[PDB]
Write an enzyme that holds these catalytic residues in place. Structure first.
Site, PDB file in Angstrom:
ATOM      1  N   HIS A   1       0.838  -1.187   0.000  1.00  0.00           N
ATOM      2  CA  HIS A   1       0.000   0.000   0.000  1.00  0.00           C
ATOM      3  C   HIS A   1       0.882   1.250   0.000  1.00  0.00           C
ATOM      4  O   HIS A   1       2.077   1.171  -0.279  1.00  0.00           O
ATOM      5  CB  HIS A   1      -0.985  -0.031   1.170  1.00  0.00           C
ATOM      6  CG  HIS A   1      -0.386   0.394   2.490  1.00  0.00           C
ATOM      7  ND1 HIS A   1      -0.407   1.705   2.934  1.00  0.00           N
ATOM      8  CD2 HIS A   1       0.249  -0.331   3.455  1.00  0.00           C
ATOM      9  CE1 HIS A   1       0.192   1.755   4.116  1.00  0.00           C
ATOM     10  NE2 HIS A   1       0.599   0.492   4.436  1.00  0.00           N
ATOM     11  N   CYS A   2       0.257   2.375   0.317  1.00  0.00           N
ATOM     12  CA  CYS A   2       0.970   3.641   0.357  1.00  0.00           C
ATOM     13  C   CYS A   2       0.075   4.674   1.044  1.00  0.00           C
ATOM     14  O   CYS A   2      -1.094   4.406   1.315  1.00  0.00           O
ATOM     15  CB  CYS A   2       1.397   4.094  -1.039  1.00  0.00           C
ATOM     16  SG  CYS A   2      -0.007   4.902  -1.892  1.00  0.00           S
ATOM     17  N   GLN A   3       0.659   5.834   1.307  1.00  0.00           N
ATOM     18  CA  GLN A   3      -0.071   6.910   1.957  1.00  0.00           C
ATOM     19  C   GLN A   3      -1.393   7.167   1.232  1.00  0.00           C
ATOM     20  O   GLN A   3      -2.451   7.217   1.859  1.00  0.00           O
ATOM     21  CB  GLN A   3       0.773   8.183   2.024  1.00  0.00           C
ATOM     22  CG  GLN A   3       1.366   8.521   0.656  1.00  0.00           C
ATOM     23  CD  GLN A   3       0.568   9.632  -0.029  1.00  0.00           C
ATOM     24  OE1 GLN A   3      -0.631   9.773   0.153  1.00  0.00           O
ATOM     25  NE2 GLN A   3       1.296  10.412  -0.824  1.00  0.00           N
ATOM     26  N   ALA A   4      -1.292   7.323  -0.080  1.00  0.00           N
ATOM     27  CA  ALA A   4      -2.468   7.575  -0.898  1.00  0.00           C
ATOM     28  C   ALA A   4      -2.027   8.005  -2.297  1.00  0.00           C
ATOM     29  O   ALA A   4      -1.583   9.137  -2.491  1.00  0.00           O
ATOM     30  CB  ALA A   4      -3.350   8.622  -0.215  1.00  0.00           C
TER      31      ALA A   4
END
Length: 108
Positions: A62-65
């Site tokens: 995933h990631c921050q956004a």
């Protein structure tokens, strides 16, 4: 093995064994968190790589956004893969998608 999955069906696997990594930053973990994930920003990955503690037969990314995990699934793959890897649809936005609150609490 590189593929995406909704935060709905992911919310399960994650609570099953699916090991999710935080290939984003550290500060993030501070403020917000995610549905099962351990600090491990791409900055650390390149500095080390897929950890063992989070090497479960199956893992997710995933990631921050931004959902730029698939954009770099090339390396992440050679980093995690062939270990069954995936993407929580959108970076965090996914977990929030369904409307799930992250671990936004110190100590907890």
């Amino acid at each position: 093995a590189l593929t995406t999955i909704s935060p709905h069906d992911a919310q399960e696997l994650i609570a099953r064994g699916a090991k999710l990594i935080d290939i984003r930053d550290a500060d993030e973990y501070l403020r917000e968190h995610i549905p099962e994930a351990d600090l491990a920003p791409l900055s650390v990955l390149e500095q080390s790589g897929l950890p063992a503690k989070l090497r479960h037969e199956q893992i997710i990314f995933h990631c921050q956004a931004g959902k730029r995990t698939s954009n770099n699934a090339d390396k992440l793959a050679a980093i995690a893969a062939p270990a069954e890897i995936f993407l929580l649809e959108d970076g965090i936005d996914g977990w929030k998608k369904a409307g799930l609150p992250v671990a936004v609490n110190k100590s907890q």
